[PDB]
Structure formats: C-alpha cells, structure tokens
C-alpha cells in the first residue's frame, strides 16, 4: 500500500508518490572530507538541553521516536550556521541489519552502524507544521553511532523497546536527558537538505557531527528486535530503515574545522 523500505515500497519507489524525491536539495549525501570547505565564519554550536522534557516513545512503523514537550524554549539549538532559535521536538534512529551499514549520511563513502537524528524547528514559525513550509524551517543534528563500548545514556531507551515492539505502540517516557547521547566534540559539517523520509520536504539545515558516539553490540541488537508490522500481522524485523545517499547537485558542504 504505502511507503517503506522493502523491495516493493522502498526508496527507489518513493518518487511516484513524492515527486520531490528527485529534487535539488535531497538528503542524505556523502560527505567528501577533501572537498568540504572550511568556513572560518561559522559560529560554535549552542546546545541547551538542560530543561528538556521527554514525554513519550512510539513505534511509528518506520522507526521509533522519542517525543519532547516543545511548547516552550526548554531544549533548544542555536549558533553554528543557524539564525534564530530552534526547538527540539523529537529524535529517532536509522540502523542496519549488520554493523557495516545503517547510517544515512556517509563520510568519504564510509557507512556507520546507525545514525541518530535530533529534529528541531525554527521558533519564528510558531509550530512545526508552519516550519515545514519554509526553506529554513528545520535544523537536524545528525550523530553517527559506531559499535564498540556501551553508551550508558542510551540504556534507558534500549530497555523500553520491548513495550513498543509493534507499529502503533507507545509508552510514557518521561525524564530522559538527551545530553547523554552527545559526543565530546561539537565540530560539524553543514549543508542545506531535506528530511530523509516521505514527505521528503526541503526545509532542513543539516548539522552532522564529525565525532561518532560508541554503543555496544548488545545495544544495537535491541534496535533490530523491533517490528515494521503491527500486532497480529506476520513479523517483519525493523532493520535497514535508511535512505541511500543522494546527488549533491548544486550544493557545497561546509566544515567548522580544518
Ligand atoms: Hg520547506
Ligand atoms: Zn531520520
């Protein structure tokens, strides 16, 4: 029926229902580190997550989202290549069936085990819905995950996945601190792009962190136990929910470091 990541409804078919899939600023893209332009005018990133208020976690059929209360400036992002304040609304992951694939963005063609997306919207627009109608309405912070040592801050998420195994399930998920998922450095690459899932809107200013965070094999294995299907339907493991790199076209990737 509708979109997914299968052979019959995967990324290569999306253009039929969403023509913008073939647009001019689609994501993700491969980050060529030797062609990326170091820009000295880029400001440091400012991440203020101390007053964050997580609310719920849900399995939407294509991934699982952890939602936040965005009714006030509680968890915001500013600085870097951004003008204005951006509010955190939710975060989700993309992962593979094996450790050698899973990330959407790649660095010099290298694929990571998973990629975390922290989604924020420009407050000047009032709400998320109005933000997705503007070229600068969203800011997404992307973080690569590699397999190695366990990430303590990620365990609370891993432990709740059992309760939201199938499509449609949700669970209260309060008091989660996002700061536990940030790498040590905030050096980044930035370029103008889009959401990586339908409707594939081109409203995103991407901020991809250079430093990946490490998670254990046992932790990523938990992600692989989720289901695409709803309860009672035949089981389809939620794996490889990532979109392949898209043509950079008329865009330049800028680096905050050299
Ligand atoms: Hg837009
Ligand atoms: Zn995403």
Ligand 1 centroid to Cα of residue 20, in Å, is: 11
Confirm or deny that 117 is annotated as ligand binding: yes
Resolution in A: 2.0
Ligand 2 centroid to Cα of residue 51, in Å, is: 23
The count of other CB atoms within 10 Å of the CB of residue 208 is 24
Domains along the chain?
1-258 (3.10.200.10)
Active site residues: 62
Beta strands, E only, the chain: 30-31, 37-38, 45-48, 54-59, 64-68, 76-79, 86-95, 106-107, 114-122, 138-147, 170-172, 188-193, 204-209, 213-215, 254-255
**Pick from 23, 46, 40, 29: which is nearest to 120 by CA?**
46
Question: CA 117 to CA 29: how far, in whole Å?
Answer: 15
Confirm or deny that 196 is annotated as ligand binding: yes
Ligand 1 centroid to Cα of residue 160, in Å, is: 33
**Residues in the chain followed by a break, C to N above 2.5 angstroms:** none
């Amino acid at each position: 029926h509708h979109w997914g990541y299968g052979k019959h409804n995967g990324p290569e078919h999306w253009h039929k229902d969403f023509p913008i899939a073939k647009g001019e600023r689609q994501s993700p893209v491969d980050i060529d580190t030797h062609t990326a332009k170091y820009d000295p005018s880029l400001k440091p990133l400012s991440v203020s997550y101390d007053q964050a208020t997580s609310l719920r976690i849900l399995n939407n059929g294509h991934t699982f989202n952890v939602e936040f209360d965005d009714s006030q400036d509680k968890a915001v992002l500013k600085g870097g290549p951004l003008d204005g304040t951006y509010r955190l609304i939710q975060f989700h992951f993309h992962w593979g069936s094996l450790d050698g694939q899973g990330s959407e963005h790649t660095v010099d063609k290298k694929k990571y085990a998973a990629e975390l997306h922290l989604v924020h919207w420009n407050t000047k627009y009032g709400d998320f819905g109005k933000a997705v109608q503007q070229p600068d309405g969203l800011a997404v912070l992307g973080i690569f995950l590699k397999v190695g040592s366990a990430k303590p801050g990620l365990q609370k998420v891993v432990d709740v996945l059992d309760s939201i195994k199938t499509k449609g399930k949700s669970a209260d998920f309060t008091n989660f601190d996002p700061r536990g998922l940030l790498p040590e450095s905030l050096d980044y690459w930035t370029y103008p792009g889009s959401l990586t899932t339908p409707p594939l809107l081109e409203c995103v200013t991407w901020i991809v962190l250079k430093e990946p965070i490490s998670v254990s094999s046992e932790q990523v294995l938990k992600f692989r136990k989720l289901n695409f299907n709803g309860e009672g339907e035949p089981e389809e493991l939620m794996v490889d929910n990532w979109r392949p790199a898209q043509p950079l076209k008329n865009r330049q990737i800028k680096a905050s470091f050299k």
